[PDB]
Amino acid sequence: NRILPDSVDWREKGCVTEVKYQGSCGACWAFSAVGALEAQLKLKTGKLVSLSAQNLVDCSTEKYGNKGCNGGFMTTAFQYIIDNKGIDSDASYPYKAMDQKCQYDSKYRAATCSKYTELPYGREDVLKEAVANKGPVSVGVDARHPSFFLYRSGVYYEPSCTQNVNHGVLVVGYGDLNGKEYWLVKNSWGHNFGEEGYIRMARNKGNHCGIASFPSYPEI
Numbered sequence: 001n002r003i004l005p006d007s008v009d010w011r012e013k014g015c016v017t018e019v020k021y022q023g024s025c026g027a028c029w030a031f032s033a034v035g036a037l038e039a040q041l042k043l044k045t046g047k048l049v050s051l052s053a054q055n056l057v058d059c060s061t062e063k064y065g066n067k068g069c070n071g072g073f074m075t076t077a078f079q080y081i082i083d084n085k086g087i088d089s090d091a092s093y094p095y096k097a098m099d100q101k102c103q104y105d106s107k108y109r110a111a112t113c114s115k116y117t118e119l120p121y122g123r124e125d126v127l128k129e130a131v132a133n134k135g136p137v138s139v140g141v142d143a144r145h146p147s148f149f150l151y152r153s154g155v156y157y158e159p160s161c162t163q164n165v166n167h168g169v170l171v172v173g174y175g176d177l178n179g180k181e182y183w184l185v186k187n188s189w190g191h192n193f194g195e196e197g198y199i200r201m202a203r204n205k206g207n208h209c210g211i212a213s214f215p216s217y218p219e220i
Ligand SMILES: COc1ccc(NCCNC(=O)[C@H](CC2CCCCC2)Nc2nc3ccccc3o2)cc1
Pocket: 022, 025, 026, 027, 028, 029, 065, 066, 067, 069, 070, 071, 072, 073, 074, 139, 140, 141, 143, 165, 166, 167, 168, 169, 214
């Protein structure tokens, strides 16, 4: 294992925005993407600003292989931001949990992206390094299991979990709670979900729920 802090929590560094609520629109991928970029924006500019998930839903569309409320990719969302030369703030381009026409306006730009990096498949050591040295990392997890929806506390370990990931989330840290290593994950199902919108998921337990399957992070 690499030399790195035993625990990280980017919330303590003011790099994580409020937990969002995606409602009945499958835009987790867009929440995951903007979450990652939000952290980089704070690191670069000193300002913590929620970015427009809606902008991705409406604008990073077929050209990026995305389907708005019916799914998409965090990496191709980053590419859209690069190509588009920006993304609007959440305040300026609010989230309506539906597919809408692209309404991007550079007058409302709140961040840029120059590149993104996809981490190697399933490597939790590399993910740890990135979370420690780069910032929060966009990942997908297998969130299909009834136990996920009902998670309240502790470290989530579900024997039935798979590496077939279906839900974009954000790794904002990691640590150890009562001898269980975890990844600290920001979800987008509101504050009602889990621990004020967060879930601790099992770390170094065989890429549990595929958390380290498809990690990426952007740079400004
Ligand atoms: C409540 O959170 C949700 C959980 C599941 C869903 N299902 C529909 C939306 N699906 C998704 O967002 C998945 C998640 C993605 C993010 C993490 C890395 C890879 C997997 N992404 C996705 N599905 C696609 C289908 C066709 C074309 C592109 C697609 O992109 C919707 C929302």
